[PDB]
Structure 1
């Protein structure tokens, strides 16, 4: 736009030299709505499974985590600009020692059992459908107490933490439930020893039973004409820090959704990214108007503001995570729902 003269050419040479970038050569710095580099994308469980198994064979140098890498993120191990999501495959009888990092993490168990993660010394047992938390700066290491492999998903705010410069890092009992649990998993009850609120949840594991039980009660209530479901046919719970009522960790939200056969959700645009895993059943997602059929274990990502919706063919169980707590804490969250 400026007259392209010698004097202007010399101004630009100076800019380059002095680490100045002018804004009138730039516009894309401030878009009309979010326009992620991350792309909607789906990973087929049967693929992730075979490559995780192969890894088990070829790499006893575990540790053995297959990071889902968004194709739009320039080769980084990021499923989105905020979140890492990986499949970790732990072999017969293997272990890891204790470390801590400021990054927040959860481990959601896909299939397997009889593995403990020891969180600040407290052994939390792991099982199909259990969500475990390793909040930032909690020592954690684990041990398989069985000849069997186990596969969980590993969800961290690694990409947020690497880009915002926030990372820090430092370096065999098998009880049936952890201390956290025995203390914190009684509904509406708070131990007088834990009257202090906490930034992350003290619940070590949100066991599948409770999740399943909750979702089913929401479906029964619909049948009985009671308010419960978020949308018709759509039962759903958010995993929460019980000291607070709020999200499990400062950076990550986790939920679980159960759709009744035939249910189709209304299209949402939400700010920030979310990942889903199909825990059980069959159905599809629509992202940017594109339908992708979905089987058990499949995972997919919905970057900021991508219009999305889900359809349950059978009864569709889906575990969910997002960076919504980052967007909400900073007043950046916005939501568009069809017909509202």
Structure 2
């Protein structure tokens, strides 16, 4: 029950408004909910829709007229018109036209670029050029200069993933503009850092983000194959039966690629059904290859190559593989884990 509605109570409340006071006893229960109840909702975007809308944006939106920023943000229908896939993460399909380029800038917001279709584009990160091709993860960690250049007449699509919404809501955003279009097969970073178990004596200092600028498909694919093969041979490897998986890591530390974003890659055997999880924080998956479905809040959605979906905080989810089902994954878990808010419920346990 509320206080008696009296002229004195109404005078009290008008003083409140005047003095920027909001009394706790008037607040709606879910200021402190029983468990996380996001304004973001579970949502799927179909690739066939996204690619068609991206191609059209290629025609209608040239460089000089918005073409420098040709990226289709996935907007969660529960987040009020904000171009946010979740309360922490921005995810967009960047569509880079034949021969297009972008100049250098840096920003405090952390970012990756996961290559969906195409080849022969380079993203240049602190002057070091990083070739892009299908299945590759590129990082452009916060405060690193990044521009790019298409070396080809072909378009490319990648997922443009950032902590923009966290950074916007929390007031951490900074931004600077920057000041040869070399096309090396591999970046300096990779040439130093992508030898397993080995660390240059010139890079003995730990870093906050990975110095690996590209995690190439070859290696991702090979790691996942080896886990399934080790499973066949009776050896521990996979995380769950038929479920091979890796986390992309900062090799100086063994932890996440960047302070705010975790990236992983999963492969499921045909037939695999994962146990239902509730996890704090939001995650986004993209179907890289294969066919299957997701269950979110008990609702099953079938999924095809390229489809993308978001699980907001604490929404119970699982995946079923119809064929071999390869998925790229990102989430805000490093944030929940750094601050001791992370929590996990699994149907098995």
CA-to-aligned-CA distance 1:2-44 (integer Å, 9 cap, x gap): 0111000100000000000000001211000000000000000
What is the deviation of 1:61?
3.2
What is the deviation of 1:88?
0.2
Residue in structure 2 matched with residue 98 of structure 1 by the alignment? 104
Residue in structure 2 matched with residue 46 of structure 1 by the alignment? 48
CA distance in 2, matches of 1:302, 1:246: 23
CA distance in 1, matches of 2:21, 2:233: 65
Q: Which blocks of at least 5 consecutive residues in structure 2 are unaligned?
A: none
TM-score scaled to structure 2, two decimals? 0.97
CA distance in 2, matches of 1:137, 1:47: 33
CA-to-aligned-CA distance 1:67-121 (integer Å, 9 cap, x gap): 0000000000000000000000000001000000000000000010000000000
What is the deviation of 1:62?
6.8
CA distance in 2, matches of 1:281, 1:179: 33
CA-to-aligned-CA distance 1:273-298 (integer Å, 9 cap, x gap): 00000000000000000000000000
Among 155, 176, 181, the alignment partner of 2:185 is 176
Coordinate RMSD, CA, aligned: 0.7
Aligned residue runs from structure 1 range 85-234, under 5 A? 85-171=91-177, 172-234=181-243
CA distance in 1, matches of 2:191, 2:30: 52
The 1:194/1:62 distance shift into structure 2, 3 A limit, reads: farther
CA distance in 2, matches of 1:71, 1:291: 18
Q: Which blocks of at least 5 consecutive residues in structure 1 are unaligned?
A: none
Q: When the two structures are aligned, how many residues end up with a matched partner?
A: 340
CA distance in 2, matches of 1:240, 1:117: 20
CA distance in 2, matches of 1:94, 1:255: 29
CA distance in 1, matches of 2:161, 2:325: 21
CA distance in 2, matches of 1:61, 1:185: 36
CA distance in 2, matches of 1:85, 1:235: 25
TM-score scaled to structure 1, two decimals? 0.99
Q: Which deviates the most, 57-66 or 123-132?
A: 57-66
CA distance in 1, matches of 2:73, 2:93: 7
